C-alpha cells in the first residue's frame, strides 16, 4: 500500500462542503445560523418537506470540477475530500437506494462526486469521500437521539421535529436500509478512493462500526480510513484543533491530519466574511507539516458552485507566501 | 391629489432584483464595482451566458406580502421596484419580450404583479422603475454615444455582443421595446403612484415627450421623477451632493450598503443611527427618503438590511417621543 | 436591602481598562487572542517593557460623568470596573504599590475614584473587579500550578520574568499585595455594592476566607460573586453554558465584541437585536446582564459599542410598549 | 541629475501620514470622521486649543524608523515620502519658526523626519517630503478661505471656526511668516531630498508658487517636484485615480506617479478595516508600472507609531504575489 508513504508526504488537501444548506447560505427567515451554516436545518428545525424543496432550486450553473481541481493543484494540494452526504441526509451522488440526491431531486441532474472523481483522476490528485454514517435528518431512524444532553451547532443531533417520538426510534433500520447501502455505492462507483472520512459516531454499535470498516477494506483495499470511525478501525488520526502541538489515539503508521475551514463555517455563509489571512493559512500549514500532520483545508462552494472569491484569493496568496518562504 | 400625499410620505422602500442578483457581486473569481447590478457590463458577459441565469432563477422564499409588511412596519408609505434594469430583463410578464421572469425562469411568476397586489392590500402606494435608455439585451440599446464617460461597468451600451457602434440606431429599440414595455407596466398592475426613469443619454426630446404623454394618459395621477427630461417631471430626484425647479416635491434615493443589487462581498451596511439621522435630515428639508433593498437569490431581504431598518425605526420612534 | 435591589437590577455596565488598552490587540505585527487584555501573557512581554506603557497612558477624553450617563441612559443600574486585572497594574492610587495609574502615568489621576463619584451622583451602584490570584508584575503571582491547561495568553503566571516555578510562593504575594490592595479599594471609594473576583487556582481555602471576612467587615452590604470560593458568595456568576443558590441572585457577564479589553482589529460587535434579545432572555430567567465596555487609549467608549448599546435600549423600550 | 533615470525605474514608494489626527483615529465624541481621518479637525471644527492639546498625549513608544524602512525595502519600495506638515499645521520635525511641532509640543520630544531621513540614508532608500503649502488650520491666515463653494472631507477648507472673519483673512501673512520659512527648514536639514510633494493649491498666487519652486531648486538641486505645486513648476506629474490609463498636464521628462492608500483613509482610522487585498495592490502596481507610472502606497501609522498589522500583512503578501508572478 504505497498510500501510507504518499499520505505521510501529502501535507495539503482541499475539503469541500456543498449541499442544499449552501442555498440558504447561513440565513433563514431573517435569522442567522450558528458558525456552522451546514447545520442550518437542525438550527431552525426546518421540516424535511420544506428543506428538501431546496433541491428544486439547486442549479449551480458555474460548478466546474476541472477548475476546482486546478485551484487545489495550483496551491500544492495533493488530494481532495468531498461531502457525499452530510447530516441533512441529501446525497451529492446518484444513489440507487435513495432518490433524495443531487441527480434525481434537482434540475442540475448531474453527479457532483462523479465529475470531481474524474477531474481528480485526470489531474493526478487523489480522491477521498466524507459520509455522515450516524446523523441523517431525512431518515426517521437517523442517529443522535441518545446524545441530546450535549448542545450542538443546531438544536438536536437527530431530526427531533419531523420525528418527535424518541422512544420509538431504532438506528438499526436506518443503518441497514440507507447507511451501509450508500457506503457500498460510493466505495464501488467513482474508482479508487484514497481516503475515507467518517463523522463522530454516537448511535453506532461496535458491530455497525466493524461492518463499515470491513466493507471499505473489501471494496477499496488501499483506502486510508480516518480515526472518527471507531477505535482500532482506522489508518490515520484526525486531530481536533485542541490536539495540535505547540510552537489521545495511537497512530500505528505515523499518519495524521487536521481539518480546518478558511472562515468559521464549513458550509457557505453570506454573513461569514471572517476569512483567515494568507499568513495565518501558511503559518498553520507549516506548523502542522513540521509535526508530520497533513492540513485538510475546507472550501464551502456557493449556490452557483463557485469557490468564494475571498477563499480563492487567500489560498493563492498563502501559496505565494509558502513558495517565497521555501526559497533561501 | 397624489401631490399632497407625496409631500407628507417621507419614506419609501426601493427594490433592485434581477438576474444580476444570482451572480451576487462576483464573476469568475473577481469583484463587480460597488454596483453589483452593473455586473454584465463590468465583465462584458455575452447575452447567451448572462440570459442563461434565467434557467437558475427560482427564489423559493420570495414573499411580496412579507416584504410589504416590513416596509409598512418601518413607516414606509410607498414601494418602487425595478420592472426592467439596464440588462433589459423584465421582472413582469411582457407580451412584447420573452426575456422576462415569467417566460424565461422556472419560478414562472410575475414579481411586479405580486408586489402590486400586496401593496394595494396593505394600503401602500406602488411605483415603477424602468431603464428607458440603456438595454444590454437589445442590439440598438442606448448609451453608444456616451462612452467618453466611465461607468460602474465597462461601456454604457452592450458593446461586446453588439460591437458595430456606428451602425446602432436607438429608434428601433425605442419603438419596438421601450415604449411598448412602458405601456404594459402602466396598463396592467393597477394605479401607479410614482414613475422612476434612468439617466437619459441616447433619447431625443421627442422620445422623452412620448414617454411623458404615455404615462400621463395611462396613469393620470402618477408623479414622474426628474430623470426623464427637463419640464417632463412632477418631482425632483436629488443626488446626496445636491441637498440644498420643483413644481414642491423632492426625493433622494439611497441603498443600505454601497450596492443597489445584492452583493455577498458588500457587508458595508449603514448603521441604524446613520439611516435614522439621514432620514430625519431629508425629512426636515421636505425631502422623501427612498431606501433601496437588494433582494437575494432566494427573494429575501438580507438579514442585516432587515435588522438595520427595524432598529432605525425604533431609534426614530424613541426620538419622536423625546 | 442590596439583595432585593440586585434581584431587580437586571442590567449593569462592566469596564476593562489598563495598559493592555494602549496595545489594542496588536504587538509587533501580530494579533492577541480574542482577549486583548491577556496580551502581556500572549507575547511574554517583560515587565520592564510592558510597564513602560504607563509613560504613554494619557487618556485626554476619559470622562467618568459621561460614561455613567451612557450606562444610565441604557437602564443600567450599576457599574463594575477593573481595579487591577491579571497584569497587576492598579487603576486607583495604591499606597502599597507604585505600579498604578496615579503614580506611574502622566494622566496622574484616580480612575476608580472618579467613577465612584460619578456613580454616587447619578444614583448608580458601584462594584469592583480585583484579580486576587494572577498578578504578572509580582514574582510570586498566582497560576504557577495551573499550566497543564491552555490560556488566552501563554501561561497563567508571568513565567518569563519569573522562570523558576519551583521557587515561587503565592503567600508572599497574597500577604504583601493582594490583601493590602483589597483593603484599600474596600476602604476608600465609599459604599461598594458588588465585589467581583477572578477564578482562583493558587489561593488556599484560608486565603479565600480572609478575603471574604475582609470584604464583610469593611463593606457589610457588598454582594460577593461566586468566583471567590464555595460558600463564600452572595450571588452566582453564570457562564452562558450554565443557564437552563440561597438568596436567588444571578449574573452573567458578556462583552459587545469578542474581547473584554479594547482591540482595534475586533470589529465583531453584536447587533442591537442580539444584545436586547440576550438581555431579555437572562432577565426572564431572573439573571442580571453585566455588559462589558472596553475603553480605548483616550478613555472613550468605542463609537460602535455606544451606538449598539443605545439601539438595543430603543429596541427594548419599543418592545416593552407593544 | 541621475534622479530622472532613477525615478523612471523606481516603480514603488511608501507614503506616510502621521500626526495628532492619528491619536483620534477616525473618531470624535462618539461620531465618525469622513473616509479621510486626517481631516478630522475640519470635520468636527475642533478648536486649535483642544486639538493642539493632543500633542500632550503623543508618545508613540513603538515608533521605529529603522523597522518602517526595513518593511518598505522588503516590499521593493525604492523611496519613502512623509508628511512634514499636513492641513492641521502641526510640523512632524523640529521647526525653528513654529513651536507647534512634534519635538517642542510632545513628551516624545524627537524629530520623526530626522529619524526617517537617517534610516532611509542607511538602507539605500531615497527620501521625499510632503508639505501642506496652502491649507494650515493652526494659522489665522491659513489658505482655503476663497474655496468653500466646493465640499471637503471635513467642513471648510480653512479653519473657519477659530478664525470666522473670512473677508479679513490674508494668506500672504501665513505664506511669508510660516510656509516659506518651514519649506526652507525641511529642504536644508535632513540631507538630500529626492522628491517634493505639495498639496492642491487654491489660495497661492502664481508668484508664491514660483518662490517655492526656486527655493527647492536652490536648496535641493536634484529634488524632483510634483505637479501639484503650479503649472510649469514641476519635474513629474501626480495622476489622480480618474487619470490612470485603461486596458491633462504635460510630462517633459516622462515622469509619473499615482498615490493611493491601502484602506480608504490616509491617516490611521480604527473603524476603517476596508484593506485592499494583496491581489488588488499587486495588480494595480503592475498596471501603473506597465504604463511607466510609479505607485506611491500610503501607510497611516497608529498612535504608538506602528504600521497596522493588516497593512503590513497585505504589503508582504502583495510582494509574494509579485515575485511569484515575475518568475512565471
Ligand atoms: C468537518 C466538520 O465536522 C463536524 O463537526 C466537527 C467535528 C470535529 C471537529 N474538529 O475538532 O476538527 C470540527 C467540526 C460536522 O458536524 C461539521 O458540520 C463539519 O462537517
Ligand atoms: C438607482 C440607481 O441609479 C442608476 O445609476 C445612478 C445612480 C445615481 C446617480 N446620481 O444621483 O448621481 C446617477 C446614476 C443605476 O445605474 C443603478 O444601478 C441604480 O439603478
Ligand atoms: C471577565 C473575564 O474573566 C476572565 O476570563 C474568564 C474566565 C472564566 C470564565 N467562565 O468560565 O465563565 C469567563 C471569562 C479574564 O481572564 C478576562 O480577562 C476577563 O476579565
Ligand atoms: C494625499 C492626500 O491629498 C489630499 O487629498 C486629496 C488627494 C487627491 C485628490 N484628487 O486627485 O482629486 C483630492 C484630495 C489631502 O486632503 C489628504 O489628506 C491626503 O494628504
Author numbering:
A (entry chain A), D (entry chain D): 2 to 248, 265 to 345
B (entry chain G): 3 to 246, 267 to 269, 271 to 345
C (entry chain E): 3 to 246, 268 to 345
Question: What does the paper behind this entry write?
Answer:
Lactobacillus casei produces a GH29A α-fucosidase, AlfC, that is ~104-fold more active on α(1-6)-fucosyl linkages compared to other linkages. This enzyme is particularly relevant because α(1-6) linkages form the basis of human core fucosylation, which significantly impacts the function of glycoproteins such as antibodies. AlfC is a single-domain enzyme that adopts a (β/α)8 fold typical of GH29 enzymes, with an active site at the center of the barrel. Our results suggest that AlfC employs a conserved hydrolytic mechanism with a specific subsite that accommodates GlcNAc in α(1,6)-linkages, while AlfC tranfucosidase mutants work by shifting equilibrium between open and closed conformations of an active-site loop.
We soaked this substrate into apo AlfCD200A crystals and observed clear electron density for it. However, despite the bound substrate, we observed no conformational changes in any of the acid/base candidates, and the Cα of D200A and D242 were still ~16.5 Å apart. 4NP-fuc bound in an orientation nearly identical to that seen in BT2970, where the Cα of the nucleophile and acid/base are separated by ~12.5 Å, in a conformation compatible with catalysis. In BiAfcB, it has been observed that the Cα of the acid/base can move from ~17.6 Å away from the nucleophile Cα, to only ~12.1 Å away. The same conformational change in AlfC would place the Cα of D242 only ~11 Å from the nucleophile Cα, in a position compatible with catalysis. Therefore, structural homology suggests the existence of open and closed states of AlfC.
